Ligand binder design. Sequence first.
Ligand SMILES: CCS(=O)(=O)Nc1ccc(CC(=O)N2CCN(c3ccc(C#N)nn3)CC2)cc1
Ligand SMILES: CCS(=O)(=O)Nc1ccc(CC(=O)N2CCN(c3ccc(C#N)nn3)CC2)cc1
Ligand SMILES: Nc1ncnc2c1ncn2[C@@H]1O[C@H](COP(=O)(O)OP(N)(=O)O)[C@@H](O)[C@H]1O
Ligand SMILES: Nc1ncnc2c1ncn2[C@@H]1O[C@H](COP(=O)(O)OP(N)(=O)O)[C@@H](O)[C@H]1O
Ligand SMILES: [Mg+2]
Ligand SMILES: [Mg+2]
Lengths: 352, 352
Amino acid sequence: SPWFGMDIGGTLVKLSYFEPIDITAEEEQEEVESLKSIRKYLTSNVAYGSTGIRDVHLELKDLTLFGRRGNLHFIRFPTQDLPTFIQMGRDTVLCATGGGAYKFEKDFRTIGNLHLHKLDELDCLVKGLLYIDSVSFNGQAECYYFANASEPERCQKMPFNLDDPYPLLVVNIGSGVSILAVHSKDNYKRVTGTSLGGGTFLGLCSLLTGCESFEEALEMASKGDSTQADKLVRDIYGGDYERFGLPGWAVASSFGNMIYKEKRESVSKEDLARATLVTITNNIGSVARMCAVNEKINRVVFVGNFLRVNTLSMKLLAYALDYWSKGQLKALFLEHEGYFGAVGALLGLPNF
Amino acid sequence: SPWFGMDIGGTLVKLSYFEPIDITAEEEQEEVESLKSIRKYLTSNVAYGSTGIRDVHLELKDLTLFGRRGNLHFIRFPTQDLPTFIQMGRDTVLCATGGGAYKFEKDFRTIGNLHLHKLDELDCLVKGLLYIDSVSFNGQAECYYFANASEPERCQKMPFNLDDPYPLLVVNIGSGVSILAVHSKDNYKRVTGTSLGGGTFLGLCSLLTGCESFEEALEMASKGDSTQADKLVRDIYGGDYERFGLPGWAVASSFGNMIYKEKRESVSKEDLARATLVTITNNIGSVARMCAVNEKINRVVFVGNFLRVNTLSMKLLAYALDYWSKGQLKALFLEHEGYFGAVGALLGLPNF
Ligand SMILES: CCS(=O)(=O)Nc1ccc(CC(=O)N2CCN(c3ccc(C#N)nn3)CC2)cc1
Ligand SMILES: CCS(=O)(=O)Nc1ccc(CC(=O)N2CCN(c3ccc(C#N)nn3)CC2)cc1
Ligand SMILES: Nc1ncnc2c1ncn2[C@@H]1O[C@H](COP(=O)(O)OP(N)(=O)O)[C@@H](O)[C@H]1O
Ligand SMILES: Nc1ncnc2c1ncn2[C@@H]1O[C@H](COP(=O)(O)OP(N)(=O)O)[C@@H](O)[C@H]1O
Ligand SMILES: [Mg+2]
Ligand SMILES: [Mg+2]
């Protein structure tokens, strides 16, 4: 039985697979051809079908898990393509989390003799995050931050130690946003959430710009100027609003200059992509800051796949959290952001 | 010297004008023809030029102010048209607030001998709100709420008494959003703000639907189904997410179904208008609820012109605040929502 952890989200399926590397001479004879073929298929390819991808750079090597040494692999594909995954599977214990573990329960059971064990998406997130940070990223820090995030000449990635992880605010930016307050390994609450998340960025971008991939949306945004669409404090006051410490550059109204027809006629699609990214990211940062202040937590870690290959949003979050909190809060990031639920599922395997 | 209070916002200019009604036989002789002409022009017309409107239904009659009896009138026009207003004024003490009091300071001073006194936009909001509620809306409650906002068969406008106004959370939904915590008549702080406000609704709506008025945007939204654009919890889980009490109908990802090309091709412009309204309104409600919980305030009053002739957003706020706070918070509304800054400015007149 291959060891898989699966997080079926609203947008992406995340899969963690443990490849044993201490396979004996006898265990290799006693392995069934279908199990050898699956292991070879997964380790021999970095693209699976037309939409599956193995994130090779995230692989954890020579991990000891459940008493065996092996490599921990990380794979993703769109939830839209799960029927293809299941159809391939029909031609066996699966720990599954995320909403899709419930929605597609009946589909997984079309695979004969498959044992489906549903686990909670946020329990799995916490357990997976704590595990990866505990075992390190092949000796390197799993957690990092942007040092001196207020000065761009100095803003650089630096490692952050999470040996005492508690308390922690976890901001899970997926299709939507969940915000968690973690007080201990078995004590955490979902403080709140927002529906303005990664799916809002991509959905609005596609409506506004016609982009048809997450990565193309980011590339457009990198070329845009969000101030062409946004109304700034200095557009309203002529400068800073000093009485309440609002700098002239702060956004007073996202997309607020688009109420003027002449401005709608001159804005570029790249400007609209950047304004969408900035709007979503600032709102997440602001909600994270309010939750942090109320939960009395000063370490805020942002995860989920809205931030993969998305340095613009990470730097924006690093800078905004530091600036608006007057330096009281720290934006933290994790190399395996995307995959913690899938790992937490995999870790539930001994219970079955 | 006519008595005017002006709030020049990022989007709208709001003007409060006190019409004296106890004018003597001698005071009428001693009044200059330009002052009689302005008073007649304002009381004889409900539309001013092409874009000025007097909200006749809001007028406060037989108000005693500064020792004179008169009528308090409420007038609005787009900040974009302020040059026309100033040009008409060139062919005199003005208390002015909002960002435009600073940005257009030099323009107001083109009016010979005009004395411009700038006042803070949130000081003026608090003073004006407390004043109007204190004098009543011609004997009727200035403040109201939607009773039994969870049951639509019972959801009806009902009056709310604010004789002891403190503490109060004031959510000012204009171009952007300011959130205030009012502890006493001279003790209040701006807790935070969000840039997802009324200008975001109108700007995104215009980009997405081509609507070209606030009122047309609301009319489109009233005909739409936001769930055509939004991804709901039940789209992700197949039902409720029970472990964290998220009902299947809650929005998991605003515009989140627009990541799928086929869904973008079938959504209507009315659906996109409604999804924009719902997205903005829920986010304001959520931010208001977090601030309320942290400031330890259970009365939340929503003002600003995003809510004028906007019952959909008011009912959405009433319902959402009650539902998500498990009944701990009350959404309150005010008949003169839009105009409190302009009134507060007018009330600063004795200081000059
Ligand atoms: C991880 C479970 S998921 O996969 O299904 N994704 C998911 C689901 C829901 C949400 C939004 C949320 O958590 N929400 C909705 C907005 N909420 C409001 C709304 C109005 C007010 C007021 N007034 N207050 N709160 C709080 C609760 C985000 C992501
Ligand atoms: C009434 C003055 S106005 O006329 O000029 N209108 C106006 C001006 C600014 C705002 C937004 C705001 O108040 N903002 C911006 C967002 N903010 C953030 C952003 C990121 C993070 C993080 N991490 N935290 N806070 C807090 C402060 C709304 C309306
Ligand atoms: N290849 C990709 N395809 C679709 N969305 C992608 C993507 N790469 C990054 N993203 C972003 O990641 C978000 C989903 O993150 P994720 O954490 O996996 O959400 P979920 N709800 O599926 O569990 C999307 O909303 C989008 O903003
Ligand atoms: N006639 C109208 N024209 C433009 N916007 C209007 C409007 N009637 C209502 N609105 C709404 O009111 C909002 C402005 O409210 P307001 O409180 O006056 O903001 P502000 N920043 O000008 O001080 C706009 O963003 C729009 O959503
Ligand atoms: Mg997820
Ligand atoms: Mg205003």
